[PDB]
Design a protein around this nucleic acid. Sequence first.
DNA 1: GTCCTATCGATCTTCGGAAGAGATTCAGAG
DNA 2: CTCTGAATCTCTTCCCGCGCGCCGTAGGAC
Lengths: 552, 1320, 82
Amino acid sequence: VPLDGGRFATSDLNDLYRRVINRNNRLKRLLDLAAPDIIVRNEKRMLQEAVDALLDNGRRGRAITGSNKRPLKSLADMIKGKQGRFRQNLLGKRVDYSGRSVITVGPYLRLHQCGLPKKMALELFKPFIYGKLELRGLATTIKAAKKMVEREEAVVWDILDEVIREHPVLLNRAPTLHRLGIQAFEPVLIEGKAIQLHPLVCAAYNADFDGDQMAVHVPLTLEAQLEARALMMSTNNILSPANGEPIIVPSQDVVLGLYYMTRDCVNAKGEGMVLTGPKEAERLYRSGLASLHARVKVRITEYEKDANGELVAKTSLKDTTVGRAILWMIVPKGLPYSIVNQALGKKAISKMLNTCYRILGLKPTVIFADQIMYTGFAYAARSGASVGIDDMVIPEKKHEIISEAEAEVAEIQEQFQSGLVTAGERYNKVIDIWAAANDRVSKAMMDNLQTETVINRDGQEEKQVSFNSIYMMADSGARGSAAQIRQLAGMRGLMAKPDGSIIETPITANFREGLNVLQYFISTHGARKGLADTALKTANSGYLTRRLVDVA
Amino acid sequence: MVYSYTEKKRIRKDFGKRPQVLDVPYLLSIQLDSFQKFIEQDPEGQYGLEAAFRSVFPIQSYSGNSELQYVSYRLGEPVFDVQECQIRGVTYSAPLRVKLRLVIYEREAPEGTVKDIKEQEVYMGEIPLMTDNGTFVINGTERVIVSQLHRSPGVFFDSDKGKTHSSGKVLYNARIIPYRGSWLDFEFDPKDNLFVRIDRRRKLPATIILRALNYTTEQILDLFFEKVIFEIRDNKLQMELVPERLRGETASFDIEANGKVYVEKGRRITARHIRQLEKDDVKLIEVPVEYIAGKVVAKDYIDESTGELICAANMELSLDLLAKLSQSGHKRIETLFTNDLDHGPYISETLRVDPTNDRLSALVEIYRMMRPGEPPTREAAESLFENLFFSEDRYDLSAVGRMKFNRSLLREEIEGSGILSKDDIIDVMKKLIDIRNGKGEVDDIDHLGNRRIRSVGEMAENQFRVGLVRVERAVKERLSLGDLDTLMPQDMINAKPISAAVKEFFGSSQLSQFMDQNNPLSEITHKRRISALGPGGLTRERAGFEVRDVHPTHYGRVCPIETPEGPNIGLINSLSVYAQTNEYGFLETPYRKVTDGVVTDEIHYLSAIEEGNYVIAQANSNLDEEGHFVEDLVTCRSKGESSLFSRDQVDYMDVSTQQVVSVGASLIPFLEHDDANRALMGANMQRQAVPTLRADKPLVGTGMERAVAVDSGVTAVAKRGGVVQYVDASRIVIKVNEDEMYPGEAGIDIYNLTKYTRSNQNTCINQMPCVSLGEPVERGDVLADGPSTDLGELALGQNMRVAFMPWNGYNFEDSILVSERVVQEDRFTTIHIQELACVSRDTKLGPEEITADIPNVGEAALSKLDESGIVYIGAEVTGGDILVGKVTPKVKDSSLRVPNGVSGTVIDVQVFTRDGVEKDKRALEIEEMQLKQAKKDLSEELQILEAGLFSRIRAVLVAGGVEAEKLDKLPRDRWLELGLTDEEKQNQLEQLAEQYDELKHEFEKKLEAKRRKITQGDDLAPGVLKIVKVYLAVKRRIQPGDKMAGRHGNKGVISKINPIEDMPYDENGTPVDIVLNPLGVPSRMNIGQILETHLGMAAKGIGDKINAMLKQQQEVAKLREFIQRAYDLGADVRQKVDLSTFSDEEVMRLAENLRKGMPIATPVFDGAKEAEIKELLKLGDLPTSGQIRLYDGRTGEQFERPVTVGYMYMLKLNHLVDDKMHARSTGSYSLVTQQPLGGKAQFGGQRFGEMEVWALEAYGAAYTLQEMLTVKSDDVNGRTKMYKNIVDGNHQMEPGMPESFNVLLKEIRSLGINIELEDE
Amino acid sequence: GFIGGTSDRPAPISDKEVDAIMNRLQQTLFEPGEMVRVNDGPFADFNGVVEEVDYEKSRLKVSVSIFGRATPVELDFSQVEK
DNA sequence: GTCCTATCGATCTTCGGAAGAGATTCAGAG
DNA sequence: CTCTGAATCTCTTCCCGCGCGCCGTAGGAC
């Protein structure tokens, strides 16, 4: 192929063939002219080595090159290799009718929908649009149809809104480790340029929306559309194939919303009255006459399907909370009330959803999941559960727990100052005392976090579970488990050297307080070790996957 | 305390506590001081091009009997300055001229020369130069060469467990690494046999070297072993005993004499036994013949009578041998000390493995194993051995290498020659054997005391040396074969090898990084970057956890946080703030010299190796303002270990809390409160921010900006103090005060500010003024703010008012909700300057043309084209418009149409044309415009200078015969002989008149040269006739999909541009701009985001109070009264400011620059505690809680429980969506295999990888796969029949067969393989 | 280096081989209709066709494609490219 | 200058990869 | 005298997308 200007791009095989042809022609010329035996032997050796370079360049003593020691690729080089035909062009090949974009979360989408930009839709569904312009008779042929599509005529958008009506699109974030990484979605046009993805699906893709690109492929033929809708649709993949675990496990924010909504407080506005039904409860809340966490008695009605399969309606008075009575308006008509009569968290909600799939079926389950997501988002917005430095609590006894524990190490040092202990025993006593101190600090911090709430119930103070922002985040299982709140409010604790040795002097600070220079330098050891561990293991995992697929 | 005028506009409140004793040094001196050490000539020829030449010249031909020797080199000035060279696209370099003296001696006579020819600095090559910003211009493209970090030359000892044979034992191996020459490695075999190798060749016996060194087995054994003596006097074989040789060991045999027996058989030996023995004079002792039999003799002993070998070196003795040899007349036997734990036989074991005999044998074996296929020869094996390790051409320990080597051998002297010596190798072997006995310790390879930094001025020197070596190789032969008579030194050499070598280094080396000019911070953090990669280093795919992980000696020299996480973590590092390179190349850092009990103000730099010899106090220790440690005991680090030590025991103290971090991490406030992972992400992201359109300031910074923005080289800085005279947003002219005015020079300094110019990331880099007409300035003040800088302080982004709360899920776990107000204010809009070129070549069928008369085109697209065929400047264009009317011969409509998607304003068109071909009309107009501008610039310079000069002349004529009538009578130029007495005033007038005449001629010559340059037909190098450059400005706004980020590792794409109504508002009605997510604060341990935010609130609150006090016409006394209170608040802070001295003019001026929030400084590890944030919030009427209640704009309800609201500094990262959204229906297809092209700049489709194929196979989708891999991509006939059916509305495919597979078949059939399809 | 059986000892050539080499060191008609290229001159390396035979003058005459015609152009003998 | 032939056909290609397994050579002895 | 051990050699393997940027036969003879 030529390049910019009157030059043709260098071709490796062409040059290998050129070398071989020149050497062989020289050998023929000599054999015609009867060159001495020594010369013809040398020419024959050179010809053999040139054929060697043409075939499997590199198996020679040294590969030949025509550049800055960049050896030329041979035929065997083109056959095998990660850039070879097998893994570069046959097993995986670039496909038309595809694109990519930066994704963003659209909470309004249904589970089976996804939003795509108008521009990407127009540039992917071009032939379908032509297939309407002739069928509508609005365009004469392709020559005018393409021009009209270029004209982005306002009628062309009506054509797109008709073409895209029921045509699935495949969305494929990469790296797609498991089959749940490729799914079909019914598209809806969106003004912007980002791909609107559903919240509940992002868990399956492991898709954090911090600038994560994702690709779309348009299934063209009829069987392709049917296969997408029947096998790869979002609603057809609610269970994980690796274990009996839903892949629609509720997101981090939604579970926070449900945890905030169904929780109960000791004394609250609108407490103790009797509500005639969930609707009246909801009205009360929206009129502001009652608090969401208020304790109340609402008449609940539930349906239980018999062993044969017909629902039996039973109605009763139930002691519950206003939030639970509101949520009960969303749970389908087949479940017991005991699932919503508890403060739901990322675990407790999950089994709930599973039970729905266990009883009602797929079709009730998907709509129930969407409704749970909607309600969770709305009431989490109403919660306004902000986080601030005022919310990170240092237990007051911590300074004492340090002041004693360090002193004990001093005693372990004093023995070492007296020759009464060995070298190793001093180390393994100091580190154990520090670990016990870390446990005490963490226990006091957790106890203070849960104890920070005490309220008056019409008389005499009584304690209860804490509405502390960090506590609700941890307890709901959204983000920030015990090991996180412990580092944020207890002490950072011990650390390890790159050789793994336990630091005799733990990081006695926590991130709410300032860490000093040496403490931070100690922390860098673990931080970089973890980052390097990730960067190196992300490759061995993939290689193991390839070996497994190619053996099975 | 005195505040500079640039500083005396916004007195940023500082929360620091420690007094900064050492200000941050120049941040780019790492580059400049090296290239300065390179280009500068030096009588100590070392460290420069003169060193490279003296390492080559003089050069002589032994057969020639004549030499040529280097005399001197003088560097010609660059032909084009940085700006012109960047515009045209050439490299910025200087011509090297070298004086060569060719001396021809004479045969049959002493070296008295017949003739010597000194060439007048013959041309040698073009060497690139380092621009004052620290960057090289190579092809218009601006490059930065990263300083490399690699193992220092010397000797290194290493051993490992498990990695070798896993059998518990460790193998000790030593390596000698010269600066330029062959590696030499000594190693122990698993059976304790010592061998050597060169360049990791095959194992050869170690002692063969000594045979090559001409050592007899007797000499070697004496060198390495100890002698134990037996005598045949006074008794049969009494032994000379050294009692200390017996210790710990059980005395396994009888030894008794002289009364008391010291130790009997079967018992150990202790010290008191040694004392009794020493009292006993054990010079002779009784041992049985069996003990004498186990020894091994030290020397050859022949039969004295027959002259035949009866004993030899390393021969093991026995009873009969003893009797025989003593009978032969050798009554004094000497054997080797071979204590197993103490005196191992390793050398003797090598003797047992040695198949070679002597020096001839040594050379034979060395030659055969070094060069298989090459026959040995006595005269030739020396030619190999000496060149291996003794000849300068192939061995040179650098000065740093020799210093490190002598340090490893504990020598008293470090100044030694570069070639190894016999005792030098002997000492290396001795240290190796001692380490094998365990009496030493192995070194750490990844220890900053073993790895040294090479910079540009050294790698370039090495490349120049390589070029000169090739040139010498050629010209030695030329002089040997040349007739030496008609030859001249220009004939001897040709520039091509040297020029090619240096050109390759500066153009395509692995370390010639293309500069990432995103903003001033990216430039700085890229110029001070340290790399472990590159030639002579390791590779990203062959490095393990050992080299990546941080090190206890990295403290104070290398930032442990700022590393490019991903494929090459830990291999690319950023040099610490204060660290600097030692003379030898190691990294040294300054520490405050602690004297006994006081911390003095004396800074001594300690390197990575010296630091272990001291005890260093941490910079956070308190002192009593007398220098004494307030704490009785202070935490210090000694040998990597850190622990408490008593006061007045410490020896040094770190100079500042920022000594551990780099600039990228130094700019992050509250770095102490962020987990190191989020710190790393924030530090990496901070250099990706795009310069916004109206970047202002950070409310909460760390004070490091006042240096980063100055040393970045992007802001216009006042060279000297003076008063501004004229500003027009392009050229600021300063009347430099006479205190620094040169007596004859103009005394008035211009500053031509650079306007909108494309950067390496297609961004605009225009500089805008900030000083006012008549404002006084002092040398070093920032006159014009560059991009991302404002009022001399670095400002990457905008401070948006953010709230932490879930809001209907639009901020779901990474997403960001942004009010429409911020996009209405153009907070984040930024300009992108794209460069599109339309080339035209003299094709084989004829020369191409650029014309508005393009064939096959209507006037609709020509509307934007001119009469010549180029777009009018300032016309707004979109994708698809024709910008250039090029035509190709034989006709074709090849013309530049705007690329799809992009749209903007055409702001610049530079047409470079090869001469000979006629210039198009618009090119003529542009050239005339350039010429008019150049003439106007030169004329304005000369005329303003003439005004100043004539005014100075009239001022001289004030005293000395002032005559107003005769002064205004004639024109001012006819003042050659104005009335003035015979004094020195007429001398000053004559001096300045000669100066004016010189200025006249200089104006003339510069104008003519500039006209010739501009009119020059630009060199279109390869067979090309003309090129048209076009520059497009795109004002990209912010849209969903764009990526924004804080300074705390918080990042996310904006998910919705929420209208103003839907945003929450507080009880004052002010709506928040950005709604962030709360659930992220804990999980990602970045609680810094919610102290800064709190502080930010207070930082605005003070401004909110000032603005009212400025909006309400408060009296200045009260305004000052408030502001001073806002400044004096806090602890005993380092910064103290008394606004009283501001005369109310600077008070009002400060307020006008403070009404938008008082900037606050929170140093990295000397930052503000929460108690001060609470105090500052208390100063405002803001809640001391930090959290406010908000109201939902849609429903008017109040959110339950208050929420955190504040002013977080947010940055728009350079990853906007419009550069990444792409979709393809049909277009280009590749040639060899018909699969669609791949990429964005090419209309390509996404690659369907193997993992996607596996996932499709996981479902039962087979039709989907068949389509995806046959019709969509590969089957050429099928994909058209599919296209037709889809247009027809049939939706049916005919797959056929993927062409690529057929290609594969041909590729296998081209071999000796017949692979074919089968029917059944 | 030399060409021989082993690098330790390169071998001579032969007795008769030297003599044969010293022996040699001491010791195409333009057909009508044939297509040739010019060897030198402004028409060198062009697709031409022989039109007639200028034999006895040690010359040549080959048709060329100039002006869109197969114009009669005459050349020297040493302009052949067979 | 263009147009041709050919590869360090008087060097020294980079030592800063692990590893995992076959293949190919060498011991202690039947 | 060469049979089963090891012992030392060579050959082969190392996630995946995206997006820029640049750089891309040489010497000497007619």
